[PDB]
Design a protein around this ligand. Structure first.
Ligand code: YOG
Length: 136
């Protein structure tokens, strides 16, 4: 029973964020800033209802969803694309498929210990992020 992802989580590693961004066609001036930033993830979860915020000094991104309920996602101030998104549980891993113009786009997010793991995929690029839970 590790489905409870509530908390504030601070990034400690970010592997291949460059390649993921390039796969999304982010221009190199934007990538040059974005690759350097420490991200924070704030998750407010009530059962299968999620409200999430990913924040940095450069850009913030909010996405809210209910597990199992397809929704329209506009990735505003990221790559600015429209996708149909569905989040499901695979065991205690939260799995998102983002169907749209990019093939094999989505993410997977799960807890181990005091860490939150997030693997972002686009095409043949995978970015692996790890966040540490912030205290009180
Ligand atoms: C926002 C902080 C970084 C902003 C700088 C990046 C700008 C360059 C363009 C694209 C990179 C998109 C990468 C972030 C993916 C969104 C996070 C996300 O959807 O996470 C899920 C799972 O946590 C939310 O529930």
């Amino acid at each position: 029973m590790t489905r409870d992802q509530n908390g504030t989580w601070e990034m400690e590693s970010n592997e291949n964020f460059e390649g993921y961004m390039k796969a999304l066609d982010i221009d190199f001036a934007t990538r040059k800033i974005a690759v350097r930033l420490t991200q924070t993830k704030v998750i407010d979860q009530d059962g299968d209802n999620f409200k999430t915020k990913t924040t940095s000094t450069f850009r913030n991104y909010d996405v809210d969803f209910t597990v199992g309920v397809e929704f329209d996602e506009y990735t505003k101030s990221l790559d600015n694309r429209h996708v149909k998104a569905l989040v499901t549980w695979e065991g205690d891993v939260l799995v998102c498929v983002q169907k749209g113009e990019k093939e094999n786009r989505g993410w997977k997010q799960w807890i181990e210990g005091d860490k939150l793991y997030l693997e972002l995929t686009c095409g043949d690029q995978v970015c692996r992020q790890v966040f540490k839970k912030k205290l009180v």
